[PDB]
Design a protein around this ligand. Sequence first.
Ligand SMILES: [Zn+2]
Lengths: 166, 167, 167, 169
Amino acid sequence: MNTIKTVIISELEKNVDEFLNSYLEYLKYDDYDQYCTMIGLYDELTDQESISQIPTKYSIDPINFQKFTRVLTVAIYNYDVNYILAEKYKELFEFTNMDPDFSPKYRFYSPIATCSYLSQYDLISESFQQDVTKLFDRMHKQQPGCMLMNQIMVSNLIKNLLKNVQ
Amino acid sequence: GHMNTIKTVIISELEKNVDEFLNSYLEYLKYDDYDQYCTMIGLYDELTDQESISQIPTKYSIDPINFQKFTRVLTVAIYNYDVNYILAEKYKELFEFTNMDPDFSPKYRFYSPIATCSYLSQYDLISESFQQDVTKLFDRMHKQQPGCMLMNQIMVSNLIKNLLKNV
Amino acid sequence: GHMNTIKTVIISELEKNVDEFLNSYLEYLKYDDYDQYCTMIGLYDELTDQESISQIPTKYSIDPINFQKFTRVLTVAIYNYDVNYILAEKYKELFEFTNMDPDFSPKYRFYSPIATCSYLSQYDLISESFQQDVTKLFDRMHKQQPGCMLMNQIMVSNLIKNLLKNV
Amino acid sequence: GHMNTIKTVIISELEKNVDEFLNSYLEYLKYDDYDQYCTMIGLYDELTDQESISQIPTKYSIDPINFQKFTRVLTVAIYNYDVNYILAEKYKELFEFTNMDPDFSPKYRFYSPIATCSYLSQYDLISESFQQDVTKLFDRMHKQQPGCMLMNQIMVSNLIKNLLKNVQT
Ligand SMILES: [Zn+2]
């Protein structure tokens, strides 16, 4: 609402919403309804207190809250620029035990394609970090050249805009 | 925090992409055409008043048909990177000279400069129906473009709109 | 003797394209002019000495001014397909018969024979200023040519030029 | 010089266009993918036997996925510049490695390297149907090409074919 960084964050979160909406295709019944409730709330998941209160405040099962946070971390990985989203959700990474400094060498993949591959991984696996690392690597090897250049153009343009304090 | 420097910051960023666009079309030019075009790349942000537009070709020894062709390549570049017509507003005197449509804005923008110039090299830049050719150009690029790229092209265009409105 | 084979075959191939240029110009001739030009297309490789050149009208029963018009059109075709002046040096005496510049070479060559003959149709072939008309002809086609075509024309010229190096 | 030297002169000239073709695709690569591809541009003329094809990636630290993608871009370049299959014959062991069709030949050749690489950047280089993608690639460029460009591409191919008539191989 205020600065360039806050507006960029809100715009990146709009794309995080679309990423999370793409995963909804693979959820059903009550898990679908709890996940939808989480999409409209995750920007509160910035401190350990709020992280522990909202699953019970909004009646979300601990397993569904666990699975949502892991899909949210992959979304953050896909849309982050200069770790501004990883820093904002600093305490979310401490809750889900995932690397806050990981960043794939290419970002802004298709949310439909990314969730299509993510749908066949065990979200709460102890090896989920390396599963995410292999997921972006596979999409990198698969991606045509024109798409990758578009992806680095998006990241570079946002990086240049963030350098503008004056 | 607000003011108008966000619009200035965005314009400088969009003009960096205009630079790469203009450099990409250099691949289709040799000899004097290449030399004159390179001179215009360093001068195009001065094409904001009718006096400069008049003096540039004779002052820098630019063939008038090469000046006309450059302003048309530059216009296609503006079409490809403009958001909320801020570039068209800044270069409103350029549109007054070229007589190109200042309200034209393609369905999707921020196409690859190499891909766009490859299509643009197929057209007669001094055609009297060049405006219709530009419309065909952006339509052809949209009908071939995968949805994954069009996604990000909308994303950047919406991000810049958000930055401009909400400072 | 492979380098002389390369130069001989390349000269023969360029003349094949001169033939197709001359065949395209037949569409602008009617009735008797058609017949004599068809003949001259088959014998222009004999126009290498002033003796032969002067004997052509009497030997082949060709109108003297239809021959001189043919030599002018042939000169334009040589300009359009020459590389390293191998055609200009072979037909050097023809350039002395027509008094056309054997050192002239346009910035780009290998234009369309259909497009070239269409513009050439507007010129008087035996005008004394036909050399300046030819300069306008190639300069006009350069100005109207899309960038992708010009890059294909220079690609063709560079490849043949590189094959001829060290001859 | 013997007539068969004409073949060597032509191959040397066609590989110059292969170099420009390979340098054009560099626009669609960044970081270490760009670096490994650059190293391969200066080594592809050694990919004429299976033992060299096997050892070049290890000796120069090229990742198998990048080596495979390089050989597929090299194959499209060979398709775009070959005449009388002289390049496909010289690099027949490359076609053995890539499993690409050594007998494929587009309707026209000598398309612009910038335009072709722009089309090529839209495709998955390691797709199982890449051969079908290549066929469609050249067919798309054919149907969009203006006739005067095509006729110059015919003229160059015909000139090289006539030169090769003097070669008994
Ligand atoms: Zn020899």
